[PDB]
């Protein structure tokens, strides 16, 4: 949406405002994560998720790697990794051409790979808002029922490996 | 779980991270600081923070009634005006015990629409965790990671498709108002319920022109068509159902009592052709019938078959089927030219899938021997598309020796794309081929 592609200190700058929100307590980002953002490897993959047409996904997945407090490392690569100790910040931007000065969520769509497991996260995310966000979207006027189904079906097997145990509750109010 | 987050938590989550999801990032913003001093912000972030039901911390900081307003809730809409960041807890709550932001992970539902919004997140954020869980770091991540990718392409293709918009009518006052006066008592209006508004050549006007305006609503979805070899031919199913969508609710628009009445108001009132020149300036008719022609060619199409199933199978059973609901012809009087350009459209997909199952072979990655035999089952498969475009020919010469004194231009002016695919497969099988003889050379001198 802008030829201005997000270079070091734009990616820098939304690493120290996106790491530090789902790496940390908000303010600042790890030192790792915002060290990563300022080097090169971040800089062209962000000037590729914000210039390149084919490039448009930057997950800087601020992986909360142990043997270093737990290191929030932003890896800013073009997919979520599996997300099982991370505390990733999947800010992939939104347009393939991001901008520098535009807002943040407009340019850089955030998403994540949570700590739990591809079932337990896939559940989570789809049942918490998935399923509203379409659910509504379609209700206020198929392939929008084809892909109502596939997710409900991708929630239902994610609820069914995301938990071996499984004891719910059934309340009565 | 028991992290219950009053407003001064929800307030100092926004005034550090609302405008970082939300807005240019940096501090507090009007936005964040009418979420901070908000209520209903505290109870949605109880709700799906604190409880462990609810994980997505919906700020609905959709930037709408520039000077954003926090609509959080605990439901989700994916509105193309909603742009909400949804701090989806990665556990199933998401505790400010630990780090208060990171209790959660933003999830920024920006203002794109339902299928736009939905092949963008999923794009950018669903296959890449369930498919990297599925291989690094059994039989439900990979295809989660499958079904991830497939809703992202469907919402996509839903995005990319050829969708027909909506046109609507614009009606006069006076017919409502004494439309809402009949309703009063149980009635409907009628000629002489006007008094005399049907001897008021002015008003006789002004709904002569009304009615013209709504011809010209209705010339506007008429002359709305598109040449079946334009894009795919996924986008050319996609464009005469929703055609016909859009031409029934149009219909019932026009069809409705009022308008109808008006049309009696104004002959009764001797305005004696406005159903004459209403009727014969619509060509509703003609396309409803025309899809009505094209009616089970359009229907039973293997489009995701084909598109959404890539594989080896299903793009042989996918063009068995595309050839089935070709078969359908004889059914549906496809025109030659027509069916040409739709022939030409479902090679090009054709190409595409072709492509997308090549990607899934991997000659490269595999051996010389077992490239020349993955260049030999898609060159297989190409081979088949031909002899599905053979037999397809074959019915369009059938539907030449029907109706030859008119349509009798089976031609064949379709390109056959799966013939250029396999002879690009072949060009790949005669690599590896000169690759094992190099081996065989080594092996041998």
């Not at chain 2, 940096?26 to 209903?40: D, H, I, R």
């Not at chain 2, 002569?208 to 996924?234: C, F, H, Y």
């Not at chain 2, 022609?293 to 996918?318: C, G, H, V, W």
């Not at chain 2, 020796?401 to 390109?415: A, C, F, S, T, Y």
């Amino acid at each position: 949406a802008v030829q201005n592609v997000a270079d070091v200190s734009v990616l820098q700058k939304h690493l120290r405002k996106l790491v530090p929100l789902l790496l940390e307590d908000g303010g600042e980002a790890p030192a790792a994560l915002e060290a990563a953002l300022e080097e090169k490897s971040a800089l062209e993959q962000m000037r590729k998720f914000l210039s390149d047409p084919q490039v448009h996904t930057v997950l800087v997945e601020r992986s909360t790697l142990k043997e270093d407090k737990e290191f929030i490392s932003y890896n800013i690569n073009i997919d979520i990794h599996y997300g099982v100790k991370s505390n990733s910040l999947a800010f992939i931007k939104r347009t393939p051409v991001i901008d520098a000065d535009k807002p943040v969520s407009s340019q850089l769509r955030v998403l994540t790979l949570s700590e739990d497991s591809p079932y337990e996260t896939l559940h989570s995310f789809i049942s918490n808002a998935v399923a509203p966000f379409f659910k509504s979207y379609i209700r206020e006027s198929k392939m929008a029922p084809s892909v109502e189904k596939k997710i409900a079906e991708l929630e239902m097997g994610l609820l069914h490996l995301q938990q071996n145990i499984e004891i719910p509750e059934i309340s009565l109010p | 779980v028991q992290n219950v987050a009053d407003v001064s938590v929800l307030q100092k989550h926004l005034r550090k991270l609302v405008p970082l999801l939300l807005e240019d990032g940096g501090e507090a913003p009007a936005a964040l600081e009418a979420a901070l001093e908000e209520k209903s912000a505290l109870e949605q972030m109880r709700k799906f923070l604190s409880d462990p039901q609810v994980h997505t911390v919906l700020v609905e900081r959709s930037t709408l009634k520039e000077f954003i307003s926090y609509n959080i809730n605990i439901d989700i809409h994916y509105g193309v005006k909603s742009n909400s960041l949804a701090f989806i807890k990665r556990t199933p709550v998401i505790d400010a015990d630990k780090p208060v932001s990171s209790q959660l992970r933003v999830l920024t539902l920006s203002e794109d629409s339902p299928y736009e919004t939905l092949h963008s997140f999923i794009s950018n954020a669903v296959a890449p965790f369930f498919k990297s869980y599925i291989r690094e770091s059994d039989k439900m991540a990979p295809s989660v990671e499958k079904k991830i990718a497939e809703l992202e392409m469907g919402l996509l293709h839903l995005q990319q498709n050829i969708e027909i918009p909506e046109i609507s009518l614009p009606i006069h006052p006076m017919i409502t108002n004494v439309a809402k006066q009949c309703y009063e008592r149980g009635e409907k209006p009628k000629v002489t319920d006007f008094g005399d508004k049907v001897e008021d050549p002015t008003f006789l006007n002004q709904l002569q022109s009304g009615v013209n305006r709504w011809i010209r609503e209705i010339q506007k979805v008429t002359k709305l068509d598109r040449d079946p070899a334009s894009g795919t031919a996924l986008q050319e199913i996609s464009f005469w159902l929703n055609l016909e969508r859009a031409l029934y609710r149009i219909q019932e628009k026009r069809e409705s009592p009022e308008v109808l009445l008006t049309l009696d108001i104004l002959k009764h009132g001797k305005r004696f052709h406005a159903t004459v020149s209403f009727d014969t300036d619509t060509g509703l008719k003609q396309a409803l019938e025309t899809v009505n022609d094209y009616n089970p060619l359009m229907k039973d199409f293997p489009l995701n078959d084909l598109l959404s199933a890539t594989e080896l199978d299903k793009i042989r059973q996918a063009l068995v089927a595309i050839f089935t609901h070709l078969r359908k012809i004889r059914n549906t009087k496809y025109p030659i030219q027509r069916a040409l350009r739709l022939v030409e459209a479902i090679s090009r997909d054709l190409s595409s899938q072709l492509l997308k199952v090549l990607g899934t072979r991997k000659l490269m990655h595999v051996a010389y021997e077992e490239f020349e035999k993955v260049m030999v089952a898609c060159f297989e498969v190409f081979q088949t598309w031909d002899d599905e475009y053979e037999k397809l020919q074959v019915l369009l010469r059938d539907i030449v020796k029907r109706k030859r004194e008119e349509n009798l231009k089976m031609v064949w002016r379709i390109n056959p794309a799966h013939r250029k695919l396999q002879a690009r497969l072949d060009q790949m099988r005669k690599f590896r081929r000169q690759h094992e003889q190099l081996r065989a050379v080594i092996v041998r001198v």
